[PDB]
Symmetry: D2
Subunit: 125 residues, 4 copies
Amino acid sequence: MGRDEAGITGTWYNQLGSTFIVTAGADGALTGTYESAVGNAESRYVLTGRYDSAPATDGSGTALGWTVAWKNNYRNAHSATTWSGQYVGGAEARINTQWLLTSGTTEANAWKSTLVGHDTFTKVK
Amino acid sequence: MGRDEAGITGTWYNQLGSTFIVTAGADGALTGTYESAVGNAESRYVLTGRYDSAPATDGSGTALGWTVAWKNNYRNAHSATTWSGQYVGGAEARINTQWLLTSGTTEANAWKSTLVGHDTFTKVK
Amino acid sequence: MGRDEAGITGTWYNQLGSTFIVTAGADGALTGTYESAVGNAESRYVLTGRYDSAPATDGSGTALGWTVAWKNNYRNAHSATTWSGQYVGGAEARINTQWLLTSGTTEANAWKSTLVGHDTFTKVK
Amino acid sequence: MGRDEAGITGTWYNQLGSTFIVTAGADGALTGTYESAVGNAESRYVLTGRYDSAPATDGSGTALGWTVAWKNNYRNAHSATTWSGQYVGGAEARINTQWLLTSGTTEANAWKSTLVGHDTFTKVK
Ligand SMILES: [Cu+2]
Ligand SMILES: [Cu+2]
Ligand SMILES: [Cu+2]
Ligand SMILES: [Cu+2]
């Protein structure tokens, strides 16, 4: 029922070699797993997020976001990343994101708690 | 079972007058609703996210994040915000965040798609 | 000649206890020194930046930004911070900023090169 | 005298078609002009910034940053962008950046004052 439900659902890969597996729900839900090719991470982590299930029909992308807390049965990196971005459909479909990775810190170290970057996800590679 | 499950669960208010209502699950899940006092928003929006359910015990905060897609039964702002931050417990408990708000745009306008800011949430006011 | 040339010029202090000393030029130039209370820093560092020397007169703030490269005669932290923000005049004058702190890294570590945060500067404390 | 003084100095182009012309000083100064291919901008704007004039020699990039206030003789967009990033030398030399673009706003609208993005600059195209 969601406009890009079919387009978003599936496996995505970013420029670092990380793998994102997501199911988009009719209502706007995103659920899946994330596996990072870098950092203090191993195997799959739970992700959850939201997307605009009724986007503009004027060539605009579809806004979405999701979160991974970097705790699973193997490791705990005491941190969470949120990706905020848009899905762009078509022959070379893309999810273009910026992200914020916050670590748990003392109050004294909170100024250096948050990394920022950008990931581009594609259906191939 | 989550260390700050009790501490995170409940109603939070930020510096803009927005209201965040969240339930923290034992496993790391965050579920709830968000009501923004500003922007192209009215009433409650679904949120989902994740938190570190077993944080460090050295005075460090608890990493977490969540997403709101700004579509509900009243409005659709074709955008999504992700908050990335940490929960700090105690007498004046806080969730200190930075956020990324991405709008759906054409490819030509993608350079101006994403706002960034910071929200501090407290249990009062 | 710049509208907030007088208002911006002088000594500013942020929430971390850092000290910013700046001279605003008529043309839009910012020149001065920065001393950080935190991180891999000691004593004063050169800063340079720019501000809007003819801002809107509708209660709006004055856009500005500046850069510090964290090399001086004492230390080199192989990094640079840029602050982007606005000056708000009046009895409790403020410079409200967000910043990006990029470290020199290998290409493999570039994903974790950039910290993000927010500093508020006041004329007192 | 600066390690990458020669490498940084010159004309750079980003993915939007914008042109950055910079001179790197021996001491760490960056001076030049910026011409944006997008947004509320026309012709050249003054930029100033800083770079690490003695970077690490372990394959690491060179940290740098600069600011443009979007006022010149043609237009005033009541805003300033800061780019924070690193210069990576070699056959395909790059300046990889993230940026913050703050507009002058009322206090009520300050939450939506700041855009964030990322630009990659190359010596060709
Ligand atoms: Cu619409
Ligand atoms: Cu631990
Ligand atoms: Cu004007
Ligand atoms: Cu060194």
